[PDB]
Each structure stands twice: as structure tokens, then as C-alpha cells.
Design a protein around this nucleic acid. Structure first.
Ligand SMILES: Cc1cn([C@H]2C[C@H](O)[C@@H](COP(=O)(O)NP(=O)(O)OP(=O)(O)O)O2)c(=O)[nH]c1=O
Ligand SMILES: [Mg+2]
Ligand SMILES: [Mg+2]
Length: 430
DNA sequence: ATAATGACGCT
DNA sequence: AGCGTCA
């Protein structure tokens, strides 16, 4: 009753760019706008691998990870933009720079946590408090929420989707108690007004469209964001959670899309997130451990405490290249040349980082994958990063891995290497 | 033969 | 430190 926490203490948003790398290429090349379009890396093998897809192309069934030659079979008029290639590898600089454009705009509104190249969580609790003060006790007009969906509405006693959107919004606003500055539903609504403003600013200042979720925590905000992509935002209230979760597959919830989510399903014999409510916290802890158990117990009730961390910048700077199949590296000279290519890209990015962000990386992590091993990494080794010098970094990287080579002939490398990865870590102020 | 990344938990 | 998970 009066002591049961409801997880309604915060207003959190997740803003995610729509088909992000595609929009970056469409801004640059007007010929690609409003067309079925995809971004591809590496053209020679099967036309390249697709890493981003416009919504027009998605309607033909084009997806990420598809080969471009195959995507063209589904969508003969598909247009393609290629990722820049530098020093023999994909170079993602253009998309990193476009990411900064969007992150810097979001940071004007609130503390953000960069969660990927194209999304950030936003803690709007404070911003909402102040806007509520400015807004007297004035009603909130539907005109202030022109792209907002209220999940779960309309309900009760129109055949167009915009008609549906409005009806639900009307029911929501009609029910809202504006006199109470402490109403969680009110707080979420004001949060959504602010996110409309944020999303308009992003589009005005960059040309990029995005979607967003507004709820009381990160997991619900992220889930909400995806419910009405593209170019729309969704409010998921605490009250909407039982119905929303009642048919929500467990794998759709952030962090449950992998092996843990699968074991939840297998061990407990359930399918939907809401079904988790029937287990005691101790029961969930017994199956999945203390941390996962407690997290699941609260999360299936719509409650989560993970804070929006104040971090706009990546914690690591890395670059990697795979060498699949026949191309696996099999000579020492091959290994050294590619370590040099990676180290050169790293130096350039690190030097830029140091100038922009007043920090220096102090540790170098070297990772390789060996032929036959289907793990991401077969081996990780680290050394000190004391100089932003590509030749030193590549030399040092070789030094810490060179003993992996089981070959008798030292000019040869065995087993062949299917991946090289250099990562600069442990930043300190500079 | 998707690739290229990036955060974080466990021991 | 080095490995595993999730995205
Ligand atoms: C998931 C994923 C994304 N990306 C890149 C391309 C995407 O445009 C960008 C953002 O990822 P996303 O938000 O998961 N997908 P999207 O922004 O292209 O499309 P939407 O968010 O579903 O509208 O990151 C990859 O390069 N490999 C990946 O596995
Ligand atoms: Mg996106
Ligand atoms: Mg994203």
C-alpha cells in the first residue's frame, strides 16, 4: 500500500535517430532522399554488407546484415551509399561526426548518457520540475504534442493512424490532473512536451529525424521509443505497464535479448514479461542470481533504478578488422602491416580526441581472433599507451601477441588470424 | 563471409 | 588482468 515504491520518481527519455547512417548519406546526397536506400560496407563481396536501411527499403524486406546483391533481389530500385574506406578498412568518421552534432544539441536540454552512436538517454526530472513552475497550473494543449503517442490509448467506447494517435492523446489529456505538480502522469506529459522541443531542434539544426520514448526509467523509455518509429515519440506511463507487458515477449526488453532472456523463458516456462510477476524475488534470485533476480522482480513491474549517467563521450576508442575465410592472415608480415593500418587510424582518432576533449588514453588493448574460434575474441592482451605514435603502438601490439604464433617458420603465422582489434582505454585528464 | 564497434559484468 | 554477454 503506502510503502510500495512504484518507480515513478524520474522522467527519463531515450532519443534514437531513424535509420541513422542512411539519413547522414541522404542529407549529403539529395538524390537519395525519400527513396529505398541502404548503407553498405565493402563492395566486392556480394555487393557489400548492409548496415543501415531506409524505411522505404524496409517495406521491401531489406534488412541489416543482408548482402547488397541479395537486397537488390527484393528491391531492384534500391539505392546504395558506401562507407568510406581508408587504409584498407571501413572508416566510420562521417557517422561519428554526425553523432556529435546530435549529442551536442541534446546536451543543451539536459544531462545525457550516450548509449550508442545514434542514441542517448535523457534525465528530464529537473527540467520538468521547472517547466511545471513556469506553466502556472495551465492545461497542456494537444498542439504541444504533435508527434506523441500515448501507449495503451485510445481505449473504450477512426480508421487512420493519425486519427488513432489523436484520439488516444485526447483521452490522456482529458484525464490529466494539472493541479497536482507531483502527479507522475503529469510529469511524463511535460517530459514529452520537452522531448517534442528537443526533437524539433535536432531536425531543424541537422536535418535528421528521430524517435523517442518517455517513461520513468531507461528500459521503459527504450522500449517506448521503438513502438512508433519512425519520426514519432511514445509516452509509456506506469499505468500502461500491465497491459503492455502482458503480451510483450521477454526478448524485447533491453538486456534480455540474449542467453539470460532465453534461460528465463526455459527455466520458468513463460513467454511474456508480465508473467514474471508471479514469482517471488527470492525465487527469481535462486534461478538467475542476486542481481538479475532483483532486477527482474522490479522490471516486470515497470520499475528500474539504473541512473542516466552523465557521459556524452565514448569511454574507449577502437578499431578492428576481420579477415574471414581464405583471407585469414597467415604471415608475420601480413599481421604487422595490418596492425600498422589499425594503429594509424587509432593515432588519428586519438590525436583528434585529445585536442577536442582534453584527455589522453593510457592503456592499449590488443585483441585477436584465431581461425576456427567463433568467439568475438580468442585472446586479449594489454600494454601501456604512452605515446600517440602509430609505429610504436603497432610494434607494442605485435610484441604482446607475437607469442600466439605456434608456427615453426617465424615468417609464417599459425593458426591464421581472422581478426585484429586495437582499443585505446583508461583515459586521464590532459 | 557481416563488419565494426562499444559498455559492462564476472572472476 | 583477461574472458563473456549484449547490443
Ligand atoms: C544495430 C547496428 C547499428 N549499426 C549502425 C547503423 C545504424 O544506422 C546506426 C544506429 O543503429 P540503430 O539505431 O540500431 N538502427 P537505425 O538508426 O539505422 O534505424 P532505426 O533506429 O531502427 O530507425 O548504427 C551498425 O553498424 N551495426 C549494427 O549492428
Ligand atoms: Mg536508430
Ligand atoms: Mg540506436
Amino acid at each position: 500500500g503506502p510503502h510500495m515504491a512504484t518507480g515513478q520518481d524520474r522522467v527519463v527519455a531515450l532519443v534514437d535517430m531513424d535509420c541513422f547512417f542512411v539519413q547522414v548519406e541522404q542529407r549529403q546526397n539529395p538524390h537519395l532522399r525519400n527513396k529505398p536506400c541502404a548503407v553498405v560496407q565493402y563492395k566486392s563481396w556480394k555487393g557489400g554488407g548492409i548496415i543501415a536501411v531506409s524505411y522505404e527499403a524496409r517495406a521491401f524486406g531489406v534488412t541489416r546484415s543482408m548482402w547488397a546483391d541479395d537486397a537488390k533481389k527484393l528491391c531492384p530500385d534500391l539505392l546504395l551509399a558506401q562507407v568510406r574506406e581508408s587504409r584498407g578498412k571501413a572508416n566510420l568518421t562521417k557517422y561519428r561526426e554526425a553523432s556529435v552534432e546530435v549529442m551536442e544539441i541534446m546536451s543543451r536540454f539536459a544531462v545525457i548518457e550516450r548509449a550508442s552512436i545514434d542514441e542517448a538517454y535523457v534525465d528530464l526530472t529537473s527540467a520538468v520540475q521547472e517547466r511545471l513552475q513556469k506553466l502556472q497550473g495551465q492545461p497542456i494543449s494537444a498542439d504541444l504534442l504533435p508527434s506523441t503517442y500515448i501507449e495503451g490509448l485510445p481505449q473504450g467506447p477512426t480508421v487512420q493512424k493519425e486519427g488513432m494517435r489523436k484520439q488516444g492523446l485526447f483521452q490522456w489529456l482529458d484525464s490529466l490532473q494539472i493541479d497536482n505538480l507531483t502527479s507522475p502522469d503529469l510529469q511524463l506529459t511535460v517530459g514529452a512536451v520537452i522531448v517534442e522541443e528537443m526533437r524539433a531542434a535536432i531536425e531543424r539544426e541537422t536535418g535528421f529525424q528521430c524517435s523517442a520514448g518517455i517513461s520513468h526509467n531507461k528500459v521503459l523509455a527504450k522500449l517506448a521509443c521503438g513502438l512508433n518509429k519512425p519520426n514519432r515519440q511514445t509516452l509509456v506511463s506506469h499505468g500502461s505497464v500491465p497491459q503492455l507487458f502482458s503480451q510483450m515477449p521477454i526478448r524485447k526488453i533491453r538486456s534480455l535479448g540474449g542467453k539470460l532472456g532465453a534461460s528465463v523463458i526455459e527455466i520458468l516456462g513463460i513467454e511474456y514479461m508480465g508473467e514474471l510477476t508471479q514469482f517471488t524475488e527470492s525465487q527469481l534470485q535462486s534461478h538467475f542470481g542476486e542481481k538479475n533476480g532483483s532486477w527482474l522482480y522490479a522490471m516486470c513491474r515497470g520499475i528500474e533504478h539504473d541512473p542516466v549517467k552523465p557521459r556524452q563521450l565514448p569511454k574507449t576508442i577502437g578499431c578492428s578488422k576481420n579477415f574471414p575465410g581464405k583471407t585469414a592472415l597467415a604471415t608475420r608480415e601480413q599481421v604487422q602491416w595490418w596492425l600498422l593500418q589499425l594503429a594509424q587510424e587509432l593515432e588519428e582518432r586519438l590525436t583528434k580526441d585529445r585536442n577536442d576533449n582534453d584527455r589522453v588514453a593510457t592503456q592499449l588493448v590488443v585483441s585477436i581472433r584465431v581461425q576456427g574460434d567463433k568467439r568475438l575474441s580468442s585472446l586479449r592482451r594489454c600494454c601501456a599507451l604512452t605515446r600517440y605514435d602509430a609505429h610504436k603502438m603497432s610494434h607494442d601490439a605485435f610484441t604482446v601477441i607475437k607469442n600466439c604464433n605456434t608456427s615453426g617458420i617465424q615468417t609464417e603465422w599459425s593458426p591464421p588470424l581472422t581478426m585484429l582489434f586495437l582499443c585505446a582505454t583508461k583515459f586521464s585528464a590532459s
